[PDB]
Design a binder for this molecule. Structure first.
Ligand SMILES: *[C@H](CCCCCC(=O)O)[C@H](C)N
Ligand SMILES: *[C@H](CCCCCC(=O)O)[C@H](C)N
Lengths: 327, 327
């Protein structure tokens, strides 16, 4: 609180903006750094989040904020300009190697400290796993899949698993209600890619005409099933179950702020007594995606710094470490 | 699996017996050591659990098992006789300093490795907190309150807390159905001590006449409220909330194996968006007390060994560390 963790956010779409708002009341964490594609903002005294959001939404980049710098190498620039202890990578993984490529930038820069992502797709977390020794040698402590799911729900399953001799199934069912289309339309193609007959390339190339066309066919509801979702490999690496016993689905209602169903994870297994049973972890319907992604993300950044300060570098998942409550 | 964790159990009432049964199918953990008040059993090749339970239930001590040694200093003897990497302290805290006194024995012996308890009462965990430097200097890694509650539910609350700016309440409600009076009547006074107008001294002095008298007044139901329960100090030490915002209650049905209500923990707080909401973690009704106490206990022993192998000694609670799934 005399010595808060100095943190940055890379990416300032809806998620990074929400992360900035979440950090505002924190005593022991201070936002000093934001970057987007076209500009960055450093302030060792703490970001003016109102000014950064104005700049981004009104002028298209935080580079246009007071103290903002326009730059086409915004991330390269920001890394070198300021004392930052940990970054939240609130970047869409677009192209599908970008998170790994931003991370390769961090490795290349000679910067050390904590990185946290809220990656979703198994194949994305697999690219970060390939970098675990590169990260370790660099002196980076990297927390992967530390959002809502993967993240919060993955940790809940890892704890719930302790009652069982054998895990049979981990089933994640999420709900999202969109309150502000503005701070979502940037990322809707990420969700549509999981729709039947879609892939990341097909979703990303869609026009708003095609998006509105698709959404009108279901009153703005995206019912997603058997998603490529890194909870599977994270629980597998944690020794809890095989990735094939993990299934992720959910509902995003693009036309209602109200969560369309209660986010939960159900962990089914057999106990040492041979009894088959299930634990369920259910999220409150008034906890938003932002709260359930960004809250854990900074809890893992804080846990990560704890690991970093004890000399433990490399790659950790949300299934591997207990997140620390941030005040 | 070529090199399993060699573990012991101190105390062989219903809980220690259940812990022995839980370890039986494990590949990467091997039970080598049991002790009770009047005898001990060491076997580096792995305990015959059938023989140990026969001896205990039939002859009143594992000292009477094959390879068993009768001894009135059973714990002092066992510690010195065998290579054991971690012990589960499945001892009733009777008298109320016994767990701390057994732990002072471990500190005095020069033995190092992992200890785990399933203590319940705040004041008991407070006695272990006083010993944290003694433990560290001794080279012991001590995992306290690593049962069902405290333990599993405490870790669930620590994870659930990450969605919130401020915690308002953590409410734990547990159910226990007693299947076998035999493996419970030894510990029923532990639960009765939490009944209205009772304390530990009054409960412990009760005759079976007085117990049966009390139980007949409620068809064998013990409805317990605002218990002295270490989940409060564990979540406080974890920086999550004040101990006064933690409340523990539940129901033990002494006359039915069926769990009388679903064990759950409800975490209420305010999100960064100012919204009040609750997460709920609910246990399966066919997960027994044994599974939900002993499963986590060995998950924390395994996590503890991981901490020990990286040179981290002293005192950890279930709120502080992610338990590791034991195969
Ligand atoms: C990513 C998943 C969001 C999880 C929402 C959980 C909740 O807040 O209850 C979306 C689908 N892009
Ligand atoms: C200790 C508490 C047991 C917790 C039971 C939880 C469950 O298995 O659902 C007892 C009251 N002695």
């Amino acid at each position: 609180s005399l010595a808060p963790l100095r943190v940055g956010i890379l990416g300032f779409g809806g998620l990074g903006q929400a992360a900035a708002r979440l950090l505002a009341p924190k005593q022991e964490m201070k936002l000093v750094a934001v970057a987007d594609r076209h500009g960055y903002l450093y302030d060792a005294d703490g970001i003016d989040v109102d000014n950064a959001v104005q700049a981004y939404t009104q002028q298209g980049s935080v580079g246009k904020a007071k103290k903002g710098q326009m730059s086409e190498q915004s991330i390269e620039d920001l890394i070198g300009e300021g004392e930052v202890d940990g970054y939240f990578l609130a970047l869409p993984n677009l192209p599908n190697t970008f998170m790994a490529d931003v991370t390769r930038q961090f490795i290349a820069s000679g910067w050390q400290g904590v990185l946290v992502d809220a990656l979703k797709r198994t194949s994305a977390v697999e690219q970060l796993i390939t970098l675990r020794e590169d990260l370790a040698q660099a002196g980076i402590t990297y927390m992967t899949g530390c959002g809502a799911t993967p993240g919060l729900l993955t940790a809940a399953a890892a704890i719930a698993s302790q009652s069982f001799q054998e895990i049979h199934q981990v089933k994640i069912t999420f709900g999202v209600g969109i309150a502000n289309w503005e701070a979502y339309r940037a990322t809707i193609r990420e969700d549509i890619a999981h729709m039947p007959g879609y892939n990341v390339d097909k979703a990303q190339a869609m026009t708003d005409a095609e998006v509105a066309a698709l959404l009108d066919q279901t009153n703005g509801i995206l019912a997603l099933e058997d998603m490529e979702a890194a909870d599977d490999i994270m629980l597998e690496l944690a020794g809890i179950c095989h990735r094939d016993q993990v299934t992720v689905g959910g509902v995003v209602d693009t036309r209602n702020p109200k969560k369309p169903l209660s986010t939960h994870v159900k962990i089914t297994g057999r106990t040492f007594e041979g009894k088959i049973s299930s634990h369920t972890f259910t999220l409150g319907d008034e906890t938003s995606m932002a709260a359930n992604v960004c809250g854990p993300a900074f809890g893992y950044l804080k846990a990560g710094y704890g690991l970093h300060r004890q000399g433990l570098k490399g790659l950790f998942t949300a299934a591997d470490v207990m997140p620390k409550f941030v005040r």
